């Protein structure tokens, strides 16, 4: 609402609204509709088949403010629009239509053909977002009206399964809205108002919005199973690929502290190909879903090794040792984060 509307859109919005409404009245007459004073559906009767001045002007103003909000959301979403040239709006070629596809009156509704206009992929994403906004507005209207979501459509209880996010909406209706809005956008583009979408900016959630402030959970064996001598082996299978650390930890490891950030833990972060002990150093490669990590510790000569599906991981140097020398201390236990 706070957006201010440029004068050229201001004196072109009426013609845009009438032309797009005429596109829908051409769509319904192609789908097989017939004009009727009463707003029937089974008998194919509705006043919204005739041109913009011959149907109820209250519906005309409804669709006019619909066009206004469409273009005004186009501006609100940062899609600045200019004109290619004023003569491209002065002269518009008209398609040829059969009479049955034509309306009742002689005001030829159909604009220059859809084939002439090309839609940039950025513009396609722009129409995708604009239809998202339109569906959100429509749903919010019925939310104020009292409608709520239901698994099955109900009229007396005011329950509609369509009151769902657009990403979960039904494909047929969402694509119908998509194509209608795409026809409208193609019309504005053909009018010489070549709209360029704002530069596509990438946003990363980075696993920040985890449920509850807990960012990780550490799983370890019991302290009594700590090994102080000998060489041992255990496996870690990664169902998913992401922020995972596996290795060996001392019985003093703190659950709230990340593995390898301090001395108690020796871990291998394969998300970043990153080894962790009192800091992070580059070691090995990254895994994928289903990869199995084999962890080796030899408490006699104080070395640790890792494998990824069998092949031994190597650091920046050709050394096979993830960690070269560490005190035995109180022992080590298997651990994962
Ligand atoms: N000016 C118009 N011209 C043509 N069709 C219109 C117009 N205004 C509304 N409609 C139709 O009426 C619908 C309005 O939805 P409404 O809230 O009345 O029904 P609903 O019970 O929520 O529908 P659904 O089961 O599709 O969710 C629009 O989706 C569209 O199909």
Swiss-Prot record:
Sequence repeats lie at residues 1-97, 98-211. Disulfide bonds: none annotated. Channel activity is modulated by phosphorylation. Phosphorylation is increased in failing heart, leading to calcium leaks and increased cytoplasmic Ca(2+) levels. Induction: By TGFB1. Signal peptide: none annotated. It is found in: Sarcoplasmic reticulum membrane. Residues 156-337 form the B30.2/SPRY domain. Detected in heart muscle (at protein level). Heart muscle, brain (cerebellum and hippocampus) and placenta. It comes from the Eukaryota. Homotetramer. Can also form heterotetramers with RYR1 and RYR3. Interacts with FKBP1A and FKBP1B; these interactions may stabilize the channel in its closed state and prevent Ca(2+) leaks. Interacts with CALM and S100A1; these interactions regulate channel activity. Identified in a complex composed of RYR2, FKBP1B, PKA catalytic subunit, PRKAR2A, AKAP6, and the protein phosphatases PP2A and PP1. Interacts directly with FKBP1B, PKA, PP1 and PP2A. Interacts with SELENON. In cardiac muscles, identified in a complex, composed of FSD2, CMYA5 and RYR2. Belongs to the ryanodine receptor (TC 1.A.3.1) family. RYR2 subfamily. Cytosolic calcium-activated calcium channel that mediates the release of Ca(2+) from the sarcoplasmic reticulum into the cytosol and thereby plays a key role in triggering cardiac muscle contraction. Aberrant channel activation can lead to cardiac arrhythmia. In cardiac myocytes, calcium release is triggered by increased Ca(2+) cytosolic levels due to activation of the L-type calcium channel CACNA1C. The calcium channel activity is modulated by formation of heterotetramers with RYR3. Required for cellular calcium ion homeostasis. Required for embryonic heart development. The calcium release channel activity resides in the C-terminal region while the remaining part of the protein resides in the cytoplasm. It is linked to Ventricular tachycardia, catecholaminergic polymorphic, 1, with or without atrial dysfunction and/or dilated cardiomyopathy: An arrhythmogenic disorder characterized by stress-induced, bidirectional ventricular tachycardia that may degenerate into cardiac arrest and cause sudden death. Patients present with recurrent syncope, seizures, or sudden death after physical activity or emotional stress. CPVT1 inheritance is autosomal dominant. Ventricular arrhythmias due to cardiac ryanodine receptor calcium release deficiency syndrome: An autosomal dominant arrhythmogenic disorder characterized by syncope, cardiac arrest and/or sudden unexpected death, often in association with physical exertion or acute emotional stress. Patients who survive manifest polymorphic ventricular tachycardia and ventricular fibrillation. Unlike typical catecholaminergic ventricular tachycardia, arrhythmias are not reproducible on exercise stress testing or adrenaline challenge. This is Ryanodine receptor 2. The chain holds residues 870 to 1206 of 4967 of the full protein.
């Amino acid at each position: 609402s706070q957006i201010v509307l440029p004068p050229h859109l201001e004196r072109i919005r009426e013609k845009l609204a009438e032309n797009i409404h005429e596109l829908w009245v051409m769509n319904k007459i192609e789908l097989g509709w017939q004009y009727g004073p009463v707003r029937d559906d089974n008998k194919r009767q509705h006043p919204c088949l005739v041109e913009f001045s011959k149907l109820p002007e209250q519906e005309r103003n409804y669709n006019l403010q619909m066009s206004l909000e469409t273009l005004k959301t186009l501006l609100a979403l940062g899609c600045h629009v200019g004109i290619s040239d004023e003569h491209a709006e002065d002269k518009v070629k008209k398609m040829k239509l059969p009479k049955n596809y034509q309306l009742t009156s002689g005001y030829k509704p159909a604009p220059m053909d859809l084939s002439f206009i090309k839609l940039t992929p950025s513009q396609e994403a722009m129409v995708d977002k604009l239809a998202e906004n339109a569906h959100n507005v429509w749903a919010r209207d019925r939310i104020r009206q009292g409608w709520t979501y239901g698994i099955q459509q109900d009229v007396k209880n005011r329950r509609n399964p369509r009151l769902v996010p657009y990403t979960l909406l039904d494909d047929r209706t969402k694509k119908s809205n998509k194509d209608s809005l795409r026809e409208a956008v193609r019309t504005l583009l053909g009018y010489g108002y070549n709209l360029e979408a704002p530069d596509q900016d990438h946003a990363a959630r980075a696993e920040v919005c985890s449920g509850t402030g807990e960012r990780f959970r550490i799983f370890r064996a019991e302290k009594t199973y700590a090994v102080k001598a000998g060489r041992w082996y255990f496996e870690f299978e990664t169902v998913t690929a992401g922020d995972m650390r596996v290795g060996w930890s001392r019985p003093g490891c703190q659950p709230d502290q990340e593995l390898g950030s301090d001395e108690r833990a020796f871990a291998f972060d394969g998300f970043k190909a990153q080894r962790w002990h009192q800091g992070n150093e580059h070691y090995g490669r990254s895994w994928q879903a289903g990869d199995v990590v084999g962890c080796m510790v030899d408490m006699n000569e104080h070395t640790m090794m890792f494998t990824l599906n069998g092949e031994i991981l190597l650091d920046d140097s050709g050394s096979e040792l993830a960690f070269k020398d560490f005190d035995v201390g109180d022992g080590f236990i298997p651990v994962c984060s």
